Each structure stands twice: as structure tokens, then as C-alpha cells.
Amino acid sequence: PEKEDIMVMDTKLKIIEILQFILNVRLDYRISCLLCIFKREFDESNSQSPGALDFEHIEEQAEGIFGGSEENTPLDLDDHGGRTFLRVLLHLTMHDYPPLVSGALQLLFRHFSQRQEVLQAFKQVQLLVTSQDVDNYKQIKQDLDQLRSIVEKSELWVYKGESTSSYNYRVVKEILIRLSKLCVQESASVRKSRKQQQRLLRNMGAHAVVLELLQIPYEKAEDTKMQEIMRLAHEFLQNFCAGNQQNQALLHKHINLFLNPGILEAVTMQHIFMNNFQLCSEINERVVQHFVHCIETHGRNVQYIKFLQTIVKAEGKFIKKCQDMVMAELVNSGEDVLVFYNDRASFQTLIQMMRSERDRMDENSPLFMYHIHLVELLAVCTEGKNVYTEIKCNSLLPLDDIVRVVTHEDCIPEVKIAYINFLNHCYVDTEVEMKEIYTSNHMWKLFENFLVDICRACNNTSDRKHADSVLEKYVTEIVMSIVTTFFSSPFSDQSTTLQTRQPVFVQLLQGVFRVYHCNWLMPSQKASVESCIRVLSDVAKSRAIAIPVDLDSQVNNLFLKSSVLAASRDYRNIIERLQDIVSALEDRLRPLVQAELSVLVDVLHRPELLFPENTDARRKCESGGFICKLIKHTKQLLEENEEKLCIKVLQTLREMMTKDRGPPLRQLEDHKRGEALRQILVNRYYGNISTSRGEMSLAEVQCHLDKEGASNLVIDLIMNASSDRVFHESILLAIALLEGGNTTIQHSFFCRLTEDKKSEKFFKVFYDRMKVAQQEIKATVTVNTSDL
């Protein structure tokens, strides 16, 4: 009925994106005015300089550029106080075109929340420091413009099967290396990240250009200049994502572009996923499995194991889910990925490769660090005292293999970390400790090698420049931990071999004390060194272990002992005053922001008032047609995958049920400011031609919403809730509607449920939503008691 032509009805949709931009540019104008306000305030502040900014003078300048002033009429689109702007959106909302009305609903959210939308945008900003900042700004501008010109001129300098192409092949490399260099600087021994240059670069948006360049198809068979260009782009991206967390989130949006079996393309992948708890909490299964499949398909590479080692342990925090998931797929990976030398025949191959690796002469290292990485990743993914990972990893590498490799004379120090610490994380640092470790003399066979290693490390006073830093780290950390965990563990005290090998314990304690005598100890490692000494002293005191008087006296002694200036100042103070002023302005808008948030529901409650009378629009709005149609729109908002809009609409509509009418001194003035702004704004929008609203009682507001179909909306949303947030909001809305024990809504729910044979989904959803809670609570509440 009344089939409006689609080609003419798409017109309004085409005006919608015009409205988007003409509303967006107002934000730039408002933030420019806000910057000018602070320009004036700092101009009057620094000239006098006791430095505090005039907030009581800033507030009216900020509120005079937002609304209710003579010079605020050009910001309003229709130059009529916004009275006629809302009616077009309201009229378009009743139209029968889904994306048109979907955009129309989005427009009014921006129109009412102008105060909110301005403040975050102004709080996200940045500014220039000294002439160096200006130079960097200019250089990055020209570099990006020149690069973009060539990007749109790609088909001229690309071989699809000095000249301009030859000139570009060179000139692009210098600009790419300049953009890469601007990201991170390198000191003598510390790699620091520049947090301001990266912010300027991301504000410019070089990442989009680099990603678009990477997307371009290419042939690596013949032209290696292109291959090194792509590698340089990857290097710049890695430097851009390094040292920051939000850049990694920004680049995460193009993970589907980086599912390639390439090497450096995979090198970018761990840089994207390094040191990010939140980002790794939602890792994709497919990428992780595809990396292992690439190992099984495209040879053995360390770039694929670095990603796994990074994702299993992010931010230094153990990840149980990733730890279990790694060996959930490692078992099915076959022996192609998991290669281990267990028997004597394979151990001989390991030793013959070890000798050549000790020579370090070619064709031995690539297989060498790969096995090192495999063992280290097993150790890292077996932390957390989790039974599953350790039991599954025990099969791949037992204690006997680790003992055999560590006891061999060609074991270089780097190998000792790789297997000794893995032995710790696989047997000692376990919730279910294996009693075979503490009941066997193999542990003392390992102590002997540790004693010889510590004697070697402490005897390195002949060549300081040739000292092994890795060996020092091993001595300071790994042995200390594997001894402290062993002695401090109450379960290991049941071993009867403690008093059978006193002479080796004497020399072991002597060596542990000797480690403290080293002058190369790091402050962090010194605590680890001292912890083992303290644990050994406590164990000796408790077990009455015979110790020589001299060593005991040494331990007791250790225990008992334990122009340019003004120019810098101006901008340095400016930057830190910007944060203060932003915070002050953000604080002095909350009493106002809920005013318009309530104007939302105020206008929605009475949408017919705004339009002039004796009109079809007012006739249809007076009957509740606006809310009724918005209900069926919100019914299908989730279908088109619009979750944020559906949440923001359900939460706003739930405000129809909370009837509120208006340190206590601050709250009083804030509430009065909010009421003062709300009344003037609502009266300006209304323009009805000493008045009282006389709102209808809350008892029949719920019935009025019931008659518009809000009873059906909640049930249908609950059945088809694909997300926890949508279902939670539906539950809150249903609670709000049925407040006070209304019988109309109850009868509507009953009749809908009994008249529809598809309530099975409804009740199954409710049944499962608590069955999952029961399953979780059964495993959650387990503490017993421990006495006072």
C-alpha cells in the first residue's frame, strides 16, 4: 500500500550523509573556539607571571559558544533555535526504509549530546612544543603528501610483468626510513620509545598509507627492489607499533590482511601482539592455529614461535587459556612441529650439532635456536601450576632427557637456562608436585653441575670484557629459584636424602654466598640471590644442619647488615595547564550533560508538541505512532548488526520509568544549573503558543508503553539476544516496566507467552542462563577453612 518509489526515497538517505559532515565540522569549529579561549587565558596569565587559571571566567566563555547566546545562531543549522531541525528527523523516522531511519536515529543522538561529544574530542587532542615540533610537523606533512601522490601514481612505477620509476624506487626508501626513524630512538644500551612522535605520526595517519601499499599485489620472483620496499614498510610498521598499546589496537583492525605465510609479515604479527593484556584476551583462534600450520607446511622458522611465546605470556602475566590452547593443538600438530631428541641415537645427533654450534661455523644455528625456542616456549606455557599443560608437556620432554643434556660437558650456558628452567616449570613449580624428583639422587647430580658452573662463574676475574652475561643471569636467577622453591616447599621436606649429602650442601651454600660477592649483580637479581641465602639459613636453623662456624658467621653478618630556561618553562607549563583546564571543563559539564540526556526522554515523551497543529505529523505523533514505529525499528536494529545503537536506545528508553523531580552544597548548585539549562532548552524547543507540565502518573506510563508494543520488544529481544549486553539491557528494561507490580504488563506477557507456541526459546534461554551460573558457582565456592 502506497508504494513510494525507491529511487526517490533514497534521496533523504543521501541528505543524511550531508548532515553527518555538516554536524562533524561544527565540532572542529567548537574546539577551535575552545583553543582560542585558552589562548586568551594564557596570554593574560603568563604576562602577569600566582598562575592559577580564571576558571570562573573560562566557564561563561565556554558556555557562550555552545548555546543560548547572540553569536550562537550560526552554529544552529536552521537559525531558529533548533525548533525546526528536530522535526525533519522525527518525520523521517516514520519512513519505511531501514538504513534511512537508522541514520536518522543516529543524527538526533549527536544533536542532543553536543556537549558530551565536544568534550571527549577536545580531550583527545595534542599541541606543538618548540620549533622542533614545527619542523617535525612540516617534514611529516611533506613526506606523507609525497608518499600519497606516489600511492595514487602506483601504476607508473610498478613493473606489472634516470627514469621516473627508477627515481621513485630510490626516493621512496629515504622517506620510508625517515618515517621509521621518527618513531623510536636508540641509546647506548637502552631502547626507549618516543611517545610524542608516535602520537604525531598516528594523528597524521601514515599507517593507512602503509597498509594500502601492502594490500597492493606484488611479484617477488624477479624484482627484489619491491621486496625490500615491502620489508621496509613492515619495518616502519613494527617501529610504529613498538613501545605503545593503543597503536597495536589500531592495527588489530586489519588482522585479516596479515594472514599470510610470509616471514616479515609474520614478524609484524608479534609486534602487534606484544605486551598487551587486553588485546591478547580476545585473540583469534584461527591465526594461532594458522601459524602452527605454517610451521607444519612452510618449514621450521623462529618467527612463528616468537608470536606464540609472546601471546602465551603477555605483560608478564600467566595466561591459563592460551597455555591450555597451545597444547590443545600441539598434539594434533604431529612430529613436524614437535621434534625432540630422547633416545641415544638422537642424543648423538644433538651432541654432534652441539660441537659444531660451539664452533659457530654455519648451518647449525638455525636448527639450534629453534629447539631453544621450543623448550623455552614449553617452559613459559607450563607456568601457573596448571595440571593440564604440565602433564601434556611431560611426554614431549621428560626429566631424564633434561638431566642428560644438562650433565653433558658441551652444554653451553644458554642451553642450561633452556632446559633447567623448563625442568623447574615442569616438575618443581607445579601444583601437583611429583615425588620422584625429591626421592631421587638426580637432583644432587644436577647440584654437582650447578656447583661447578658457579665455581666457573665466580672465577671470571681474568677477562671482564669476555664475561658471559647469559651465564651470570643463569647463576643469579635460575639456580636461585630452583633451590629456593625446593627448600621452601613443605612437601619436599619429606625427602630423606637431605642429611646424606652434607659435603655438597656445604659447598653449595658457599657458592651461593660467593655469588653475593660479585660486583656485577643487578639490583633486581640481588633480591633473588639473597632469597636463596635466607631460605638456606632458615632450613639449616630448622633442621639443625651441621655448618662450619665461619660460614655461619658470614651468613649471620650478611643478615645483620641487611634564554633556554624560560623558553622551556613556558611550553612545559603550558602543556601541563592544558590537562588541568581540560579536566576542569570536563568536570563542569556533567551537571549539564544529564540535562540534555533527560531532554532526550522529555522530547520522546511528547514528540507531537514540537510540530505545528492541524497537521498530519502531529496527528500521527499524538497517537503514539512515533514510539510505536521506533519499537519495530529497534526490533530489527540487532538483525542488521547494530549493537551500540540498540544499547544506546534501550538504555535511553529505560529512562521513561525513573521519575525524579528537582558536599550537599555542590550537589545543590549543580542540580540547579542542570534544571536552569534544561528548562530553557526545552522551552526553546517547544515554543508552545506561567505554565505547568502536569506529567501523567507513573502507573499508566507503563501501560502506555505496553500499548505501543514494548511488551513484545522485550520478549523478542530476549529470544534473539546474541550478546550479553543486549540481554542485560532487556532484563533491566523489563524490570523497569514491571515496577510496582503492574497487572497490565503482566497480563500482556502472559497472553503473549500462551498465544505463541515459540516460548520454548524464551524459557530455554532462561533455563540455560542459570544452568551456566550453577556450573560456574559449583567450581567457584571452594575455600573450606583455615582456623583463626
Partner 1 sequence: SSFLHIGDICSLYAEGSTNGFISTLGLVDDRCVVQPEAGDLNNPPKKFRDCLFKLCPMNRYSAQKQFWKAAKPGANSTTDAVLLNKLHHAADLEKKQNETENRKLLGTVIQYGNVIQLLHLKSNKYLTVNKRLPALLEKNAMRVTLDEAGNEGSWFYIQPFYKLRSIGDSVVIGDKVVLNPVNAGQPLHASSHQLVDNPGCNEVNSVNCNTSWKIVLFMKWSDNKDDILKGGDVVRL
Partner 2 sequence: KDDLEMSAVITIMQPILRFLQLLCENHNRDLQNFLRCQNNKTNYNLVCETLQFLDCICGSTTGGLGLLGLYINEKNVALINQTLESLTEYCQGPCHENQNCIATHESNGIDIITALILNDINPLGKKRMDLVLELKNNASKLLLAIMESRHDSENAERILYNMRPKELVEVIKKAYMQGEVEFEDGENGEDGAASPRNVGHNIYILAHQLARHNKELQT
Pick 142 or 775: Cβ nearer partner 1: 775
Site membership for partner 2, residue 647 (CB under 8 A): no
Pick 432 or 455: Cβ nearer partner 1: 432
Residue choice 256, 496, 563, 785 for contact with partner 2 (CB under 8 A): 785
Query: Shortest Cβ distance from residue 608 to partner 2 (Å)?
Result: 31
Pick 113 or 488: Cβ nearer partner 1: 488
Q: Count other C-beta atoms under 10 Å from residue 615's C-beta.
A: 12
Pick 724 or 787: Cβ nearer partner 1: 787
Q: How far apart are CA 553 and CA 549, in angstroms?
A: 6
C-alpha distance from residue 786 to each of 80, 702, 783 (Å): 72, 52, 9
Site membership for partner 1, residue 786 (CB under 8 A): yes
DSSP β-bridge partners for residue 241: none
Four-CA torsion 510, 512, 515, 517, nearest 10 degrees: -50
Pick 222 or 776: Cβ nearer partner 1: 776
Three-state SS at 185: strand
Site membership for partner 1, residue 335 (CB under 8 A): no
DSSP β-bridge partners for residue 347: none
Pick 780 or 784: Cβ nearer partner 1: 784
Secondary-structure percent of the chain, ordered helix, strand, coil, rounded to 5: 70, 0, 25
277 and 314 Cβ atoms separated by less than 8 Å: yes
Q: Which does 526 bind (CB under 5 to 8 A by kind): partner 2, partner 1, none?
A: none
Radius of gyration of the chain (CA): 35
In this structure, the chain runs to a length of 788
Three-state SS at 383: coil
Place of cell 664475561: 467
Angle (nearest 5°) at CA 467 between 463 and 468:
160
Pick 399 or 682: Cβ nearer partner 1: 399
Query: Shortest Cβ distance from residue 712 to partner 2 (Å)?
Result: 16
Site membership for partner 1, residue 432 (CB under 8 A): yes
Query: Between residue 741 and residue 770, which ones bind partner 2 under the rule CB under 8 A?
Result: 741, 743, 746-747, 749-750, 753-754, 757, 759-760, 763-764, 766-767, 769-770
Q: Which does 331 bind (CB under 5 to 8 A by kind): partner 1, partner 2, none?
A: partner 1
Query: Shortest Cβ distance from residue 388 to partner 1 (Å)?
Result: 9
Site membership for partner 1, residue 461 (CB under 8 A): no
Pick 722 or 775: Cβ nearer partner 1: 775
Q: How far apart are CA 341 and CA 370, in angstroms?
A: 13
Residue choice 197, 738, 752, 761 for contact with partner 2 (CB under 8 A): 738
Query: Shortest Cβ distance from residue 416 to partner 1 (Å)?
Result: 25
Query: Between residue 364 and residue 393, which ones bind partner 1 under the rule CB under 8 A?
Result: 387, 391-392
Three-state SS at 313: strand
Residue choice 394, 439, 712, 759 for contact with partner 1 (CB under 8 A): 394
Site membership for partner 2, residue 321 (CB under 8 A): no
Pick 210 or 375: Cβ nearer partner 1: 375
Pick 23 or 391: Cβ nearer partner 1: 391
Query: Shortest Cβ distance from residue 408 to partner 1 (Å)?
Result: 23
718 and 765 Cβ atoms separated by less than 8 Å: yes
Query: Between residue 507 and residue 526, which ones bind partner 1 under the rule CB under 8 A?
Result: none
Pick 530 or 729: Cβ nearer partner 2: 729
Which of 728, 740, 650, 647 shows the shortest CA–CA distance to 702? 740
Query: Shortest Cβ distance from residue 395 to partner 1 (Å)?
Result: 4
Which of 635, 670, 679 shows the shortest CA–CA distance to 653? 635
Q: How far apart are CA 317 and CA 121, in angstroms?
A: 33
Three-state SS at 4: coil
DSSP β-bridge partners for residue 314: 317
Which of 710, 716, 784 shows the shortest CA–CA distance to 742? 710
Grid coordinates representing 444 are 644432587
155 is in an annotated binding site: yes
Q: Taking contact as CB under 8 A, which single stretch among the options 111-119, 241-249, 273-281, 731-739 is the one that binds partner 2? A: 731-739
Q: Which does 769 bind (CB under 5 to 8 A by kind): partner 1, partner 2, none?
A: partner 2
Phi-psi region of 661 (alpha: psi -120 to 50; beta: other; left: phi over 0): beta
Q: Which does 80 bind (CB under 5 to 8 A by kind): partner 2, partner 1, none?
A: none
Q: CA 615 from chain center: how many Å?
A: 52
Site membership for partner 1, residue 784 (CB under 8 A): yes
Q: Taking contact as CB under 8 A, which single stretch among the options 23-31, 286-294, 530-538, 780-788 is the one that binds partner 2? A: 780-788
Q: Which does 787 bind (CB under 5 to 8 A by kind): partner 1, partner 2, none?
A: partner 1
536 and 498 Cβ atoms separated by less than 8 Å: no
C-alpha distance from residue 326 to each of 26, 260, 382, 383, 419 (Å): 50, 20, 10, 13, 19
Site membership for partner 2, residue 277 (CB under 8 A): no
By rule CB under 8 A, what string of x and - marks binding of each residue 697-726 to partner 2? ---------------------------x--
Site membership for partner 2, residue 735 (CB under 8 A): yes
Q: Which does 387 bind (CB under 5 to 8 A by kind): partner 2, partner 1, none?
A: partner 1
Three-state SS at 551: helix
Q: Which does 692 bind (CB under 5 to 8 A by kind): partner 1, partner 2, none?
A: none
Q: Which long-range contacts (CB under 8 A, 24 or more apart) does 747-752 make?
A: 748/706, 748/711, 749/711, 749/715, 752/711, 752/712, 752/715
Site membership for partner 2, residue 783 (CB under 8 A): yes
The alpha-helical segments, DSSP class H, found in 205-243 are: 206-215, 224-241
Q: Which does 394 bind (CB under 5 to 8 A by kind): partner 2, partner 1, none?
A: partner 1
Grid coordinates representing 371 are 629447539
Residues whose CB falls within 8 Å of the CB of residue 669, separated by 6 or more in sequence, listed in order = none
Site membership for partner 2, residue 137 (CB under 8 A): no
Pick 10 or 400: Cβ nearer partner 1: 400
Q: How far apart are CA 686 and CA 690, in angstroms?
A: 15
Q: What are phi and psi of 191, to 5 degrees?
A: -100, 105
Q: Please say whether the dihedral angle defined by the alpha carbons of residues 64, 68, 69 and 71, taken in this order, is positive or negative.
A: positive
Amino acid type, 212? E
Grid coordinates representing 420 are 633447567
Q: Which does 177 bind (CB under 5 to 8 A by kind): partner 2, partner 1, none?
A: none
Grid coordinates representing 26 are 561544527
DSSP β-bridge partners for residue 185: 192
**Residues forming the site for partner 2 (CB under 8 A):** 724, 728, 731-732, 734-735, 738-739, 741, 743, 746-747, 749-750, 753-754, 757, 759-760, 763-764, 766-767, 769-774, 776-778, 780-781, 783-785
**Residues forming the site for partner 1 (CB under 8 A):** 331, 387, 391-392, 394-395, 398, 432, 784-787
| Binding-site residue positions | 152, 155
| Binding-site residue positions for Ca(2+) | 152, 155
